[PDB]
Design a binder for this molecule. Sequence first.
Ligand SMILES: O=C1OCCN1CCNc1ncnc2[nH]c3cc(F)ccc3c12
Ligand SMILES: [Cl-]
Length: 167
Amino acid sequence: VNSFSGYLKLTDNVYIKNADIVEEAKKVKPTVVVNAANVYLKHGGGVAGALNKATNNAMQVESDDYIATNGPLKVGGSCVLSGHNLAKHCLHVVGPNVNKGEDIQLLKSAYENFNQHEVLLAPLLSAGIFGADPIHSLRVCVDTVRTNVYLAVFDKNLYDKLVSSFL
Ligand SMILES: O=C1OCCN1CCNc1ncnc2[nH]c3cc(F)ccc3c12
Ligand SMILES: [Cl-]
């Protein structure tokens, strides 16, 4: 039993809810919140800009130190950093940006990072401002993630279509 409330069960391990991941993280304080990161951990907009704003820019400060030490992430890769006031940990995961022609096959590699964590709150990787089809992102998630994932979807319209087209 866990504290994730009001989710619609899609599969054995995947659950979905119309919610802003930021507000959902603030309420649940999950062990792991997933950020829809880019390789530079520049959290300007989308999930990343919104999470970072909710941390009062502390996520960005921590991220800049991470990049200065380690260099950029890989597309499809991830790193674990602090969850600040939102979660214990933040798993920064880089899905491909389709608007720049990055290989959508890397979306599966991106979701594989979730399997290193038993339970996660997460957005749809590569959806929204990253330019991929959110229906496809959900399909890859369900077919790749084996650990327990709670997907927060911001747009009510999008949430209802993702549910409706699933089975
Ligand atoms: O649902 C969706 O509609 C448009 C894209 N998208 C899926 C990807 N985005 C999100 N996913 C989940 N929570 C979010 N909170 C946010 C707060 C923001 F300021 C910006 C973006 C999000 C967001
Ligand atoms: Cl977005």
